[PDB]
Amino acid sequence: GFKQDIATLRGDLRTYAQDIFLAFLNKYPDEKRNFKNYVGKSDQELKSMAKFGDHTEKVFNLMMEVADRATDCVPLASDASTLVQMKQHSGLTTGNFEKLFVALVEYMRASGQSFDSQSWDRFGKNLVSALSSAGMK
Numbered sequence: 001g002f003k004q005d006i007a008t009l010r011g012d013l014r015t016y017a018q019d020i021f022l023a024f025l026n027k028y029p030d031e032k033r034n035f036k037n038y039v040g041k042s043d044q045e046l047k048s049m050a051k052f053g054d055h056t057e058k059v060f061n062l063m064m065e066v067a068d069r070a071t072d073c074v075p076l077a078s079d080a081s082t083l084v085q086m087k088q089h090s091g092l093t094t095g096n097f098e099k100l101f102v103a104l105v106e107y108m109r110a111s112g113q114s115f116d117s118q119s120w121d122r123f124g125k126n127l128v129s130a131l132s133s134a135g136m137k
């Protein structure tokens, strides 16, 4: 289920974080506008870059903590508020988070593995709802 999926992802988090984030940027090329320094790069070029591996892994370190603190795929309001307030997210709207979770769910569906993709899709929906509620447009 969802909790085991957190353990699976954490067991190889650098790899999953890069692969899911690349799935997100390739599915929604226009999202490269928030990361201007990733433009005109192949996947292998991005994985060679410092900011890419470090930043993507830090995103997923926190995403897994938010997942782990959730009840029935419903995140804490405090985790939602942190995500909205962060200076690094000043630009963003719920659509940015929408798209990241569509890509994550698709990645899980396509994987060889028994991910609980339905639980991640509900988690994404519930996080978008919590971000809206905490003041993201």
Ligand code: HEM
Binding pocket: 031, 034, 035, 054, 055, 058, 059, 060, 062, 063, 066, 088, 089, 092, 096, 097, 100
């Ligand atoms: C649950 C989802 C997400 C989590 C947990 C999360 C978490 C984080 C964390 C921890 C950082 C700081 C990392 C660092 O400075 O090394 C960060 C920065 C950032 N995040 Fe997010 N993030 C999420 C979703 C998004 C989405 C959907 C976008 C854009 C579409 C985004 C854009 C950014 C940007 C642009 C930065 C700063 C740019 C940079 O790294 O130089 N994040 N996020």
Ligand SMILES: CC1=CCC(=C(C)C)CC1
Binding pocket: 021, 035, 051, 052, 053, 054, 055, 056, 059, 088
């Ligand atoms: C905070 C952050 C850092 C790195 C990212 C990558 C896509 C490498 C985006 C999110």
